[PDB]
Design an enzyme around this catalytic site. Sequence first.
Site, PDB file in Angstrom:
ATOM      1  N   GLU F 423       0.835  -1.193   0.000  1.00  0.00           N
ATOM      2  CA  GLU F 423       0.000   0.000   0.000  1.00  0.00           C
ATOM      3  C   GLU F 423       0.872   1.246   0.000  1.00  0.00           C
ATOM      4  OE1 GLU F 423      -0.910   2.349   2.652  1.00  0.00           O
ATOM      5  OE2 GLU F 423      -2.798   3.131   1.871  1.00  0.00           O
ATOM      6  N   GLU F 432       5.555   7.963  -3.086  1.00  0.00           N
ATOM      7  CA  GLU F 432       6.340   7.341  -2.027  1.00  0.00           C
ATOM      8  C   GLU F 432       7.221   6.221  -2.565  1.00  0.00           C
ATOM      9  OE1 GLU F 432       2.490   6.700  -0.706  1.00  0.00           O
ATOM     10  OE2 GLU F 432       2.859   7.420   1.333  1.00  0.00           O
TER      11      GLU F 432
HETATM   12  N1  LIG Z   1      11.664  -0.148   1.253  1.00  0.00           N
HETATM   13  C1  LIG Z   1      10.833  -0.532   2.226  1.00  0.00           C
HETATM   14  N2  LIG Z   1      11.034  -1.733   2.811  1.00  0.00           N
HETATM   15  C2  LIG Z   1      10.210  -2.117   3.789  1.00  0.00           C
HETATM   16  N3  LIG Z   1       9.163  -1.468   4.304  1.00  0.00           N
HETATM   17  C3  LIG Z   1       8.988  -0.288   3.709  1.00  0.00           C
HETATM   18  C4  LIG Z   1       9.753   0.248   2.685  1.00  0.00           C
HETATM   19  N4  LIG Z   1       9.277   1.494   2.314  1.00  0.00           N
HETATM   20  C5  LIG Z   1       8.251   1.683   3.108  1.00  0.00           C
HETATM   21  N5  LIG Z   1       8.020   0.649   3.975  1.00  0.00           N
HETATM   22  C6  LIG Z   1       6.982   0.568   4.995  1.00  0.00           C
HETATM   23  O1  LIG Z   1       5.727   0.603   4.357  1.00  0.00           O
HETATM   24  C7  LIG Z   1       4.753   0.977   5.353  1.00  0.00           C
HETATM   25  C8  LIG Z   1       3.621   1.755   4.706  1.00  0.00           C
HETATM   26  C9  LIG Z   1       2.249   1.336   5.216  1.00  0.00           C
HETATM   27  N6  LIG Z   1       2.307   1.167   6.701  1.00  0.00           N
HETATM   28  C10 LIG Z   1       1.178   2.372   4.873  1.00  0.00           C
HETATM   29  C11 LIG Z   1      -0.201   2.050   5.454  1.00  0.00           C
HETATM   30  C12 LIG Z   1      -0.747   0.664   5.095  1.00  0.00           C
HETATM   31  N7  LIG Z   1      -2.234   0.657   5.165  1.00  0.00           N
HETATM   32  C13 LIG Z   1      -0.191  -0.408   6.039  1.00  0.00           C
HETATM   33  O2  LIG Z   1      -0.456  -0.278   7.259  1.00  0.00           O
HETATM   34  O3  LIG Z   1       0.479  -1.330   5.532  1.00  0.00           O
HETATM   35  C14 LIG Z   1       5.511   1.720   6.459  1.00  0.00           C
HETATM   36  O4  LIG Z   1       5.414   1.008   7.686  1.00  0.00           O
HETATM   37  C15 LIG Z   1       6.963   1.743   5.962  1.00  0.00           C
HETATM   38  O5  LIG Z   1       7.886   1.529   7.023  1.00  0.00           O
END
Ligand SMILES: Nc1ncnc2c1ncn2[C@@H]1O[C@H](C[C@@H](N)CC[C@H](N)C(=O)O)[C@@H](O)[C@H]1O
Lengths: 10, 10, 6, 6, 625, 625
Positions: F423, F432
């Site tokens: 997401e 993002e």
């Molecule tokens: N390169 C990456 N590797 C691992 N996790 C990532 C990376 N980029 C972003 N994230 C994670 O992606 C998540 C984005 C989501 N939490 C956004 C809301 C979504 N509804 C959820 O709760 O999954 C964040 O916790 C970030 O830490």
Amino acid sequence: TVAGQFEDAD
Amino acid sequence: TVAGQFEDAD
Amino acid sequence: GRGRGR
Amino acid sequence: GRGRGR
Amino acid sequence: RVSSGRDLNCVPEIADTLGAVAKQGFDFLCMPVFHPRFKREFIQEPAKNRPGPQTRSDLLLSGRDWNTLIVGKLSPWIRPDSKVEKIRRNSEAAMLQELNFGAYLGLPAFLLPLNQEDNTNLARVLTNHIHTGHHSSMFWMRVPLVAPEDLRDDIIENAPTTHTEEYSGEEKTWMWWHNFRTLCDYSKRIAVALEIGADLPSNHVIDRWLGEPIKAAILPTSIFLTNKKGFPVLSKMHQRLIFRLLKLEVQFIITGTNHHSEKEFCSYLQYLEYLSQNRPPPNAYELFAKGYEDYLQSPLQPLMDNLESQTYEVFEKDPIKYSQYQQAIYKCLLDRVPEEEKDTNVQVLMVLGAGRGPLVNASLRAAKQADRRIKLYAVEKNPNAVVTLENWQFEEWGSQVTVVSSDMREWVAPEKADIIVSELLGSFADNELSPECLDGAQHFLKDDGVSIPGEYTSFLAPISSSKLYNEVRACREKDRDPEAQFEMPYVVRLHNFHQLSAPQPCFTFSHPNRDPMIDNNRYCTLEFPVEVNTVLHGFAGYFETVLYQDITLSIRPETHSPGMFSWFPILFPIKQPITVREGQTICVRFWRCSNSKKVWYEWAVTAPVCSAIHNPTGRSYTIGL
Amino acid sequence: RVSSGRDLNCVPEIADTLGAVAKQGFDFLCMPVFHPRFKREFIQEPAKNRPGPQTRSDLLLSGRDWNTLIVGKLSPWIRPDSKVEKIRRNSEAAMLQELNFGAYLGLPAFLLPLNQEDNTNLARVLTNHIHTGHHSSMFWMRVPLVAPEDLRDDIIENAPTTHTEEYSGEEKTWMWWHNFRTLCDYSKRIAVALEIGADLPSNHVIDRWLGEPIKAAILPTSIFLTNKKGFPVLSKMHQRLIFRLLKLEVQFIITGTNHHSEKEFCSYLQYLEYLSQNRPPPNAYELFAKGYEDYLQSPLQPLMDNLESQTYEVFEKDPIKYSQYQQAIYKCLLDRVPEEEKDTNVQVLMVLGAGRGPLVNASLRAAKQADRRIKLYAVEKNPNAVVTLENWQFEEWGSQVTVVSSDMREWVAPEKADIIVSELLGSFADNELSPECLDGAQHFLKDDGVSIPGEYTSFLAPISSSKLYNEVRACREKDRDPEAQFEMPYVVRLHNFHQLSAPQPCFTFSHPNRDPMIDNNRYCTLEFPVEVNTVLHGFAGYFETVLYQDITLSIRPETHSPGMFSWFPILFPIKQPITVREGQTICVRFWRCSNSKKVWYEWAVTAPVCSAIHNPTGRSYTIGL
Ligand SMILES: Nc1ncnc2c1ncn2[C@@H]1O[C@H](C[C@@H](N)CC[C@H](N)C(=O)O)[C@@H](O)[C@H]1O
Ligand SMILES: Nc1ncnc2c1ncn2[C@@H]1O[C@H](C[C@@H](N)CC[C@H](N)C(=O)O)[C@@H](O)[C@H]1O
């Protein structure tokens, strides 16, 4: 107050 | 509550 | 500003 | 910040 | 009202712990985010490959509860300044992890212990964190009043405790804080959580801690004495210190165990409430100043600016100033007009800068009570104040009062005034160019005329205030010289400050000025003995005035006029804090300069350590003529 | 309630007038500070020496009443743009005097007219007043929707009106406004108070007006129709316009006289209340967004910095997104696993950026409803979110979930994944770095793997709004390029804005990118027809994503998903507003550059007027990677 006080003008 | 509950110690 | 200031 | 903002 | 919290190192569960804490009556709970004994490795495997959760989940409490009800504590095993590289690195990693988790929970504040002579690495880690992300949280340093090394019992056969009168050895704790504060560039997000020991230090130390950004005070349960009824109580000196802290509005954190097991723990808190009640109610001045304590405001300059209606409205709320003006006018009228000439002699009285007319009303009342005939002029340059004055004159005063809508310096009066009454006194005596206006108005005063106020003097006093310095530094205005905020004075209530010496006179002005030389440029030098060994942050400026003979009006702390609240002390900042010692008399120099078109102040400190001349040539702050 | 006021120019006495106005239910009164017919001179000897007060004093009302209840009006006789030098100078002096008096009273707002085309001198005087001292009185320009010259009846024999459509002639009033605010440099203290008038202009004109910073709306009592019961009412077009204005939280000012004498004046206000109620109540999205409208906030960058618990909590408040994700997972599982293989066939599923675990719960519930066996690998880089996931995993989650604390770009999965869920979608399609992360994660996706995020496309639409332009201009901060605020996108709930054309697709991404040379740099060109003269201020950006098949999450207005309040539209400002005419085409170009360890957008409008490339080399905005 009056019934239909705000009713549109015809 | 108690009367003089906070009276200074001596 | 109450007193003597802005 | 709500929505997707900060 | 008093806000207090609880300090705990064990929390088997969060919900029940908060329930019990609330039942006891505390407002917030200080808890460790991680288990205090759960050491964690970050470099050397297989320890660093530890499975499972690292701490309790953040879903136990709602976001609202975390943001208000919890204060994080750093783990006790984290020693970033250890002498071992492995321990130092592990401590750095653990502190970063814990601070990041605290930010994740959005804790309102985080408690960091500060109990070593050297804590440079901790400062580095904290300041690195303070520049990463949003980190809205505040940081409280738990710094003891007395170092544990000093209050340990003398029960070691071959490690005797020091008995020499180490006057400078009792301030070491403050130094620990001061140093740490400097390394973090006086960060606004770093405050102090003072910890009160059973034994208190000399009064000068407790004064030292005034002016520091104290947010919380930690009371161990072991400092409470027992009254004959078996309840906890505090010693008289402790009670006085608590009253002072309450006047500073800190939050009290009760720490320790229930030593008075015969009574509920809440009893401790109850006692504080009792003290909160014994606090004398605020006086009229304190209530008036409530809200703008240590709040920076630019001084007014009525000569080139025009004041709003609300400004005059707040001016008129002070009865002391106008009552004393009336008394002075009445005494002057009695002196000038003898009884035999009461019916035939009429005195000309000119009110300069009448504003909305309160001075005119005072003059009329004084003339009526003195039963002396008078003819009154009211000079005012503000057109809107002129409108209000004209409405007053048409409605109430009648022909007795003649309103003039002109600057007194340019106006040509039709008659020579017997008395000239004026109010142009800013926080500093001559801040609002009262001398210039009055010397311009002198030309139409009688040879035997009288000028009220008769004379006024200004006083300066060095002051130390970390909070005031931080707020001044936070006054950065874009589109301007980066260091201009330090070169202009502000009017502040100076609620949280330490005064390093008694004020001394700076400039004196008297009217009418019959001296053939008529100049207002002035140069003064002041010497201030210092007996505290603290850091100088600025100069507080007060003033006094003699309206007529005995009638006086002052804001100096020693002779402050009772109840009067029309003026706040002015503040002259210094670009860089200057440390001082037990000797090292502070030598400062002040200039009042003008160029027939502007007026400005230049000040510099020459001893103990020199500093740049502030506001040269009105570079950063001037008052238009 | 609906803030309503009364407009009067004859106020014999303030006290009784305010009493009557309050009784009728109005909230504020618009009155003249000076008597409308009391002409005043400033350069003629006999006239300029006029004695007596020039207006009623401010003592008649409490300072609070002035600051909240009253709204000043400019005297009708003042014509700063007169052709006669003497009249022009007198008008300038009188207007300056009235504005200064209004500031002295501290009026919340001051109402000035724009009844004629040329207003240059008036704008100059007002701007000079604004840049003089400090005051907070807003200025409302009274601008009729239809110019007075066009509303006059066809009574003149020698000057007959014309029935020509005059499509360009209906906008003239707006031009008067547009020039004026241009002269004053889009000052945030200038707002419109448009007058409805009897007849409305073309709907496009009203739509254009609604994008301007309207603070008040003047309703003459002559526009109200009379119903069969004799009460005042409004036509259908007027009712629709009133609804649209109410949606903007405008202040209604009833002006004129009680034409329906048989009834009371309050009858007018009551009718507005009847319109205030019965209007379409706000939906879930509108209620959610309340408090954040036209408020600029920087976009999140979860890759670089870790989010807080509150951010994840608000993400969870949206049920629609996770319901759609669950539906997509359900469909994919059904398609991939036939019934005969419902057992003995475990599909390996991966959730990337699991956050606090809502996606994992959605996946588990989808598997349960689909009656298929699976195994999850929750991947999260945020260590605190990892802690929350681990705690959620130790209980209430079997061995199915396998929390992993690593960046998906670096994690080495032990098993290929049948599906991958994410997401990482932002306000813009790829704000993002979803493409980069998904490309990195593709290496451990099976040959026939499925990426639930599927496809996503971004859409751009030109938008004009003075409110957003003023806000972004106010976002200028020290310690950086003064034009930087215009070279970064802001997430904003566009409320007071006008859309100049329908959105068009900007960028499209699909996963997995099985083609070689996987590059994310992109370049797009968009042409937007324009049907009305306007002033382009920026580009609004939306996104629309297809999850799997037939399941879509959309925020573009034409196909916005119901109740989807997780994402607000993005805004790309242009530092110079671009005037556009009817029939012209706005041609804009967008670049997405992904230099190593860095990503940013660059946009530039090439037609009808070129503009400098914004954010070259990501000097002002970057996504970090
Ligand atoms: N390169 C990456 N590797 C691992 N996790 C990532 C990376 N980029 C972003 N994230 C994670 O992606 C998540 C984005 C989501 N939490 C956004 C809301 C979504 N509804 C959820 O709760 O999954 C964040 O916790 C970030 O830490
Ligand atoms: N050179 C000047 N000539 C005339 N009026 C002046 C001059 N400088 C200051 N003033 C006025 O002096 C007034 C200052 C007083 N109102 C201050 C409060 C005082 N308690 C009073 O109400 O009189 C303001 O109305 C200024 O406009």
